[PDB]
A = this chain, B = another copy of it.
Amino acid sequence: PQVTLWQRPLVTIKIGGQLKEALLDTGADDTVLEEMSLPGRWKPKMIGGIGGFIKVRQYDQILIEICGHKAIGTVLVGPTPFNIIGRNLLTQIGCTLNF
């Protein structure tokens, strides 16, 4: 759908049998999700943002349905204020930025 930027672009995602709300985020290379339970294995990782670096658990390849659209990729779970869908999944649902 087309989404204007007068408001945060949040979408509903279902991950892991749970529904979440997440921000669509063109500056983020990676999807980062607030602490939640996934089944399976993960790797420790660190990413930086404004403010600092956080240590995060890298899970792949997780199925996520974002709006209607299914995608599979790496998600990282950690101490983020908000669930962020970054460009690794945005490419997968065909998202463009248009001005």
Contact = CB atoms under 8 A, between A and B. Distances in A.
A63 interface: no
Interface of A: 1-6, 8-9, 23-29, 32, 47-54, 67, 69, 80-82, 84, 87, 90-91, 93-99
Nearest to A87: B5
Contacts of A53: 51
Contacts of A48: 50-51, 81
Q: Copies per complex?
A: 2
A51 B51 CA distance: 4
A94 to B, nearest CB: 5
A95 B98 contact: yes
Given A3-B97, A97-B2, A26 B9 contact: yes
